[PDB]
Design a protein around this ligand. Structure first.
Ligand SMILES: [Zn+2]
Ligand SMILES: [Zn+2]
Length: 110
């Protein structure tokens, strides 16, 4: 179910994650990394009010919340080989289990 994204170091990863607006208009969203045998790492989250279009920066991560297109877009800039790993976009609502959007992204940076 994971999709491979093969990129060269220095490139920017862009991932478009649709979300169901009827269900998740007023929910927080997040980008997570999934290290093997560890808890998900939440890398960047949207901010309140959760229904509003937004763009948040957190280090090399950018999350664009585009409800007009029922879309969350994630960008990671200046990729390094050590960014290689499994990631996902989610509906974020702890302590409830995240709802996975789209499909997991297997990022391979060389
Ligand atoms: Zn929720
Ligand atoms: Zn290289």
């Amino acid at each position: 179910e994971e999709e491979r994204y093969d990129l060269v170091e220095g490139q920017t990863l862009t991932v478009k994650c649709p979300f169901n607006i009827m269900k998740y208009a007023n929910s927080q969203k997040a980008w997570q990394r999934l290290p093997d045998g560890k808890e998900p790492l939440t890398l960047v989250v949207t901010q309140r009010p959760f229904t509003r279009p937004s763009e948040v920066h957190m280090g090399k991560f950018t999350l664009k919340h585009d409800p007009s297109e029922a879309m969350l877009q994630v960008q990671m800039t200046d990729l390094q080989v050590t960014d290689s790993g499994l990631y996902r976009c989610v509906i974020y609502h702890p302590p409830n289990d995240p709802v996975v959007l789209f499909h997991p992204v297997r990022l391979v940076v060389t």
